[PDB]
Amino acid sequence: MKIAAFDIGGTALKMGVVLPHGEIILTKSAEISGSDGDQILAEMKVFLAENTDVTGIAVSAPGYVNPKTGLITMGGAIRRFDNFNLKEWLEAETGLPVAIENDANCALLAEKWLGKGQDLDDFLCLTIGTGIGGGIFSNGELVRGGRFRAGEFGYMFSERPGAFRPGKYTLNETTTMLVLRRQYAELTGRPLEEITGEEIFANYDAHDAVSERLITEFYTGICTGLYNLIYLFDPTHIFIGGGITSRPTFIAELKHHMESFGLRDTIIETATHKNQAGLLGAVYHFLQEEN
Amino acid sequence: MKIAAFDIGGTALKMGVVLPHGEIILTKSAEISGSDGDQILAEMKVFLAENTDVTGIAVSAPGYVNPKTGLITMGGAIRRFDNFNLKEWLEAETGLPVAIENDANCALLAEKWLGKGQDLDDFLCLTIGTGIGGGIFSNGELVRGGRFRAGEFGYMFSERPGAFRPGKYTLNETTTMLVLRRQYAELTGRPLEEITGEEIFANYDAHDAVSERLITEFYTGICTGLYNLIYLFDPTHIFIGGGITSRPTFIAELKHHMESFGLRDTIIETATHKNQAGLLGAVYHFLQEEN
After folding, report:
1. What are the respective helix, strand and coil percentages of chain A, to the nearest 5?
2. Which residues of B touch A155 (CB under 8 A)?
3. At the topology level of CATH, where does A2-101 sit?
4. Can you tell me which residues bind ATP (chains A, B)?
5. Residue A236's closest chain B neighbor by CA?
6. Which residues of B touch A (CB under 8 A)?
7. What is the rounded distance in angstroms from the CA atom of residue A48 to the CA atom of residue A15?
8. Is A77 known as a binding-site position?
9. What are the C-alpha distances in Å from A70 to residues A8, A62, A85, A144?
């Protein structure tokens, strides 16, 4: 058994041939322009023709996916995949068994299978980069929700909502690495495209007041979301991943900030398998489905 | 089989003899002073001696309860029940099988057993009165959490947390029937003890500006919590109960307010069995445990 795995990202499509124990024996990546579903389907077709010994296909996809039927009801950034049965498409194209699961869920499944969540029944995964991702593991099972939408952690309010559209008051729009860069551009007058997260943190470490405020507010927003999650789900562990891991000391920094809030026994630590989690979790889902 | 059921409330202890199909053939209630655990234990002993044909005991208790062992790790308002195994106490006192579950969880279980959640795998219960309660049903199972703490909906932030203790910025302290009365007392200068929720709503319906603001802010806080819950859990239904049901049109009023937020397919409606939900859910848990 050799499984063709696909992980549909924000800017790249990752692909691999994976053995049932998580050994990835071949990889391929492609930059994808403007999250164009047709380009993604084309890259898939090309990878499959190149790898004729695969016996199964496993997909990690953005948006909302019925994991049994393969119907993507909302394709995340990929409008082409709205109301698209990608499982049935791939089955028709190849004659191979296919499984599909949401991207955040797949990364959580990687954590459960091969990472730090192997023996945990109640943990969350929180991903912080350009946006916010979430996955929920409760009672030893993924929580997908009634319409496969669960885990939208970025939609939590970080402040009392005002009169602009509600999204503006949510973590997705207040508390991300992108928002930090946007704010720094506004405060300094410099072009966004020339600002890095690394420089903001470097300025922070050099006690720059503007940077201090930006980072302080960022951590407060993260703490707001963590407090909500802790009280709602009562996980034992929250694994934090994404672009934020570009800050080496971020877990220690969050714990410090959390002294004003209270972790309340919850363990916070980094997620594992940053590079391959989507592929590996897609495989885990596929392996569960084959049984 | 006749089950002695106990539901430990904020100001009353409800008691009943319940048949396995939810017919409650006898009831008794006692006002409890200052949530005194010893008084509760005394009332239990008296009810049991009065009802010698009971064959089992089912408890709905505040705080955090290990439902298999019966250990109450934190007794809610009842300090006497902190780190107290109420299951083992009752077993030793009576020789009868005993089950125990948290109060919010029991009320949700009543909804699942006999109410509006019978055929639902993903729903929440939100209780709004003097404080806020929560119960979570995901993947066809109660979510209790890693330490039996899950469902603390009142700890969600309704605004960006400030520098006072975090609780002050949570639904428990910003968005309750008690907070409404407190605010009305502050705004009018009248004593809290002389203010009713009913008068605030009556003044609201008569277009009193002060009342309008209080009610508007209350509904915004509820909408903040509902939006968070909807995105996190993706329930099909959220059942809302508690003191707030003293407002006959509150569901219609919340739906109206939610037009600025978006229910996103979620059905909101009132919880059922307001009077007996704790008793009935305690029984359901007991019946599950006996198998």
Report:
1. 45, 25, 35
2. 227-228, 231-232
3. Nucleotidyltransferase; domain 5 (3.30.420)
4. 5-11
5. B146
6. 120-123, 134, 136, 138-139, 141, 143-153, 155-161, 166, 220, 223-224, 227-228, 231-236, 260-262, 265
7. 10
8. no
9. 15, 13, 5, 14
Name the method of structure determination. X-ray
Within 8 A by CB and 6+ apart from A11, the residues are A31, A32
Q: How far is B139 from chain A, CA to nearest CA, in Å?
A: 7
Closest CA to A101 of A132, A134, A123, A68: A68
Longest dimension (CA), chain A: 60
CA B108 – CA B233 distance, rounded (Å): 15
Return the domain boundaries, chain A: 2-101, 102-291
| DSSP annotation of A239 | E
Chain A positions contacting chain B at CB under 8 Å are 120-123, 134, 136, 138-139, 141, 143-153, 155-161, 166, 220, 223-224, 227-228, 231-236, 260-262, 265
Strands B141-142 and B132-138, sheet pairing: antiparallel
Pairing of strands A98-102, B56-61: unpaired
3 state DSSP class of A82: coil
Structural contact between residues A3 and A20, judged by C-beta atoms closer than 8 angstroms: yes
DSSP, residue by residue, B200-264: HHHHHHTT-HHHHHHHHHHHHHHHHHHHHHHHHH--SEEEEESGGGGSTTHHHHHHHHGGGT--T
Residues 6+ apart with CB under 8 A from B176: B128, B129, B130, B131, B132, B154
DSSP code per residue over B144-175: --TTS----GGGSBSS---SS-GGGGBHHHHS
Candidates A99, A48, A105, A93; CA nearest to A291 is: A99
Minimum-distance CB partner of B147 among A160, A224, A234? A234
Per the CB < 8 A criterion, the answer to whether B81 and B156 are in contact is: no
Residue A88: burial class (beta carbons within 10 Å; 0-12, 13-18, 19+): middle
Fold: same for B2-101 and B102-291? yes
CATH of domain B102-291: 3.30.420.40
Q: What is the resolution of this structure in A?
A: 1.6
Question: Would the CB atoms of A138 and B145 count as touching at under 8 Å?
Answer: yes
Contact residues, chain B, for A74 at CB < 8 Å: none
Which residue of chain B comes nearest to A262, CA vs CA? B166
Choose among A126, A242, A131: nearest CA to A178. A131
Nearest CB to A236; choose among B146, B152, B157: B146
Q: Alpha-carbon dihedral of residues A237, A241, A247, A253, nearest 10 degrees?
A: -20
* Binding positions of B for ATP: 5-11
Rounded Cα–Cα distance for residues A265 and A9 (Å): 33
